Amino acid sequence: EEETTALVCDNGSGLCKAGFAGDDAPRAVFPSIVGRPRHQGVMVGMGQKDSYVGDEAQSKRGILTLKYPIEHGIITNWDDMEKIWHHSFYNELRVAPEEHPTLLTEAPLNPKANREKMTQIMFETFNVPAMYVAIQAVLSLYASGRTTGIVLDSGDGVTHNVPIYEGYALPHAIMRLDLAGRDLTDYLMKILTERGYSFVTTAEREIVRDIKEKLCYVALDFENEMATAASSSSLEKSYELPDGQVITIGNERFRCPETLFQPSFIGMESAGIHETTYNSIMKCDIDIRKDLYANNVLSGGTTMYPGIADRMQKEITALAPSTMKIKIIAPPERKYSVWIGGSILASLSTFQQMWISKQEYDEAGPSIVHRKCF
Amino acid sequence: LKIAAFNIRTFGETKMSNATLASYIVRIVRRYDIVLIQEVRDSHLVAVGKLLDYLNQDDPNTYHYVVSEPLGRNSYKERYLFLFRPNKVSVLDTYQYDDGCESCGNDSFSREPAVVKFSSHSTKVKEFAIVALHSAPSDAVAEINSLYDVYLDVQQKWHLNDVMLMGDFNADCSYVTSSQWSSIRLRTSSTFQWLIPDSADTTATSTNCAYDRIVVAGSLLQSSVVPGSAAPFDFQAAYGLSNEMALAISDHYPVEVTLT
Ligand SMILES: *[C@@H]1O[C@H](CO)[C@@H](O[C@@H]2O[C@H](CO)[C@@H](O[C@@H]3O[C@H](CO[C@H]4O[C@H](CO)[C@@H](O)[C@H](O[C@@H]5O[C@H](CO)[C@@H](O)[C@H](O)[C@@H]5O)[C@@H]4O)[C@@H](O)[C@H](O[C@@H]4O[C@H](CO[C@H]5O[C@H](CO)[C@@H](O)[C@H](O)[C@@H]5O)[C@@H](O)[C@H](O)[C@@H]4O)[C@@H]3O)[C@H](O)[C@H]2NC(C)=O)[C@H](O)[C@H]1NC(C)=O
Ligand SMILES: Nc1ncnc2c1ncn2[C@@H]1O[C@H](COP(=O)(O)OP(=O)(O)OP(=O)(O)O)[C@@H](O)[C@H]1O
Numbered sequence A: 001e002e003e004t005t006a007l008v009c010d011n012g013s014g015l016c017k018a019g020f021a022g023d024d025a026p027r028a029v030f031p032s033i034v035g036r037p038r039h040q041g042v043m044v045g046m047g048q049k050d051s052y053v054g055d056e057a058q059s060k061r062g063i064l065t066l067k068y069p070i071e072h073g074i075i076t077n078w079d080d081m082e083k084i085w086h087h088s089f090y091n092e093l094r095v096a097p098e099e100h101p102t103l104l105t106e107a108p109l110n111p112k113a114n115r116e117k118m119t120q121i122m123f124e125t126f127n128v129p130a131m132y133v134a135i136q137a138v139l140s141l142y143a144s145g146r147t148t149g150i151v152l153d154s155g156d157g158v159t160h161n162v163p164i165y166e167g168y169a170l171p172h173a174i175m176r177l178d179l180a181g182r183d184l185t186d187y188l189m190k191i192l193t194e195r196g197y198s199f200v201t202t203a204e205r206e207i208v209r210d211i212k213e214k215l216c217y218v219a220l221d222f223e224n225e226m227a228t229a230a231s232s233s234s235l236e237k238s239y240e241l242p243d244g245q246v247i248t249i250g251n252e253r254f255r256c257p258e259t260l261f262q263p264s265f266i267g268m269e270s271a272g273i274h275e276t277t278y279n280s281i282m283k284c285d286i287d288i289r290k291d292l293y294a295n296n297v298l299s300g301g302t303t304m305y306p307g308i309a310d311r312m313q314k315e316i317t318a319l320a321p322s323t324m325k326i327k328i329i330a331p332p333e334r335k336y337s338v339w340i341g342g343s344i345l346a347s348l349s350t351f352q353q354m355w356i357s358k359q360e361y362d363e364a365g366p367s368i369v370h371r372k373c374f
Numbered sequence B: 001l002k003i004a005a006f007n008i009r010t011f012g013e014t015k016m017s018n019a020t021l022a023s024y025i026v027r028i029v030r031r032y033d034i035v036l037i038q039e040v041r042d043s044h045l046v047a048v049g050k051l052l053d054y055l056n057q058d059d060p061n062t063y064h065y066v067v068s069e070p071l072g073r074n075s076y077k078e079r080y081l082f083l084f085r086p087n088k089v090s091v092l093d094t095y096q097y098d099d100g101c102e103s104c105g106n107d108s109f110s111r112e113p114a115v116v117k118f119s120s121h122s123t124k125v126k127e128f129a130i131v132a133l134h135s136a137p138s139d140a141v142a143e144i145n146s147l148y149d150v151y152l153d154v155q156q157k158w159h160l161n162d163v164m165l166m167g168d169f170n171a172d173c174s175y176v177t178s179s180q181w182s183s184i185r186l187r188t189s190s191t192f193q194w195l196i197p198d199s200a201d202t203t204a205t206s207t208n209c210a211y212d213r214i215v216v217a218g219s220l221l222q223s224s225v226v227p228g229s230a231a232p233f234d235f236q237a238a239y240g241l242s243n244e245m246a247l248a249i250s251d252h253y254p255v256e257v258t259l260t
């Protein structure tokens, strides 16, 4: 007999991923932007629309004042976040929130208050029957079929290192690197404009993100790469601009993600991904550490680059004490890992018990009471 | 009411980023109560937005807009844009022509017409549709003939006889010869009055072609047009422009008319 279906929403700084518990992939992936009409008018088959959310807002952004409600993993503007949730159930998912248990994901070290305003909108405004809120990184790890590992999760606006032991994140060993996807796309636009290419129009600037996702990669040894490109043409690749004129970049390709290891390149006096991972593991309890080096899972869109896994392997090995079995695990579906995690959990009958129902909410909702490992 | 149909060449970001070209467009758009802007290649409505930022600057309602989606048979795509003064007229309904099937608009047109129902509270016609067409010059005779079935469709949908049809029909020179006018129902039938004649020059270029036309059907609408008001407005002559400067704005002239 089919059981009443739960929903999984993962609301990232660049993209919302949303869908049904049981599927292998979010039935909905749209950007996390809300736009209001800067001027009155109408689209030809249409009635005046007061606001747009997702693809629609970015397609018409030239006539809207756009809003990005999730700033670096944290909900910053709760009104526009209602528009998004609203859009997810009624437009995208085509469901009535009143009859579907929703599981929501959150950032590492999300304010106790925010989780609560989130619990409250769901119950009060969306009248969700039952609801769960899990930490993004834990979902990626459990999605690897595991409960112990350390996770690097790198999206569009934030990157975090999160040690999780036996299924719970170890709160003060979490590192937060304020550099991710958007910064890398902007850095690639930086590079290419120095080179006399211009991406001035909205269409043109939009496509940088696509050469980013297409042709960028991580050099196992930046320094040697740098020499290869100076002497050959093998590293060079071209890309046709939307306007037919072509683009050809060669060393750019590993220079932009190199920012993840050397934040120097964007003037970010801060440490890079490899070392942030190292430093988190050193805040952990020395027995679990063996397990962390071996269950060092990669998660998120910025985790996508070819090569990245081998450099994490290499860089952590030249830093990790000589006997640790370092294992960088990078799943094929890893840009969807958190959502997939969320789906997998929500599907287990077991999990029906941990689900907080509106009934529990008659008895308030405090949820967080944040904690240890340091 | 004063209405125009202006084909502004590669209306888009770049164009509307250039402050001198934008000033000019603004000065031209402000003559009109309803202006149709064709050839809007603006992927994200940024230039439409910038234009509007200019127009609505000190009264957020000097102009409202109606705009289609990118149209074209999977190739280069452009939008139809109607801007109006909401204090002079009102859009009661709008739709995009298709036939009885969704791919079907495109079997007869490359940029399938947008038609808009306006209420005019200042002119003898009080209600009328405008149908916009920017024809594809190699298909011009066929399209401008199919424009007659779109007049039919507006009558069946909206019970409206008063229909103004306008745009860059490419209706002259090598895309429509004298002999081919007999193939165009729109012209052949007495239901239609062609207000921009064949002798007009509506191109900013050195060509002498009545590319851009305004047609009016319905005896009430035909009675509202002020006689002798339909003309290309030659902005080059009007603002004492050089050739270069005038073509930088567009290779076409707005074709306008006045209704009373
Ligand atoms: C925004 O959009 C606008 C329009 O799309 C863009 O503007 C155009 O951009 C181009 C390139 O940047 C401009 O070209 C420069 O300007 C002069 C070229 O024009 C001269 O050509 C002839 C004479 O040769 C003449 O027609 C011009 O005079 C005007 O004519 C009109 C029409 O009759 C009149 O109404 C006006 O009142 C004027 O009289 C004008 O003289 C050049 O200066 C320049 O070239 C350089 O010239 C240097 C100086 O040497 C001599 O050059 C000529 C010939 O003798 C003369 O102009 C000058 O007095 C000197 O005697 C020389 O040392 C250099 O090596 C080089 O050759 C450029 O070609 C164009 O004019 C802009 N306007 C228009 C309307 O197109 C704009 O860029 C866009 N972008 C932005 C961000 O705004
Ligand atoms: N193949 C790829 N290579 C590199 N970057 C990619 C690739 N695929 C997606 N991206 C980038 O991943 C980022 C989006 O990833 P993700 O969905 O994990 O972020 P998010 O959840 O929106 O935001 P955050 O998790 O930072 O709050 C974007 O910068 C996107 O460009």
Ligand SMILES: [Ca+2]
Pocket: A011, A012, A013, A136, A155, A300, A338
């Ligand atoms: Ca994320």
Ligand SMILES: [Ca+2]
Pocket: B201, B202, B203, B204, B205, B206, B207, B208, B209
């Ligand atoms: Ca001419």
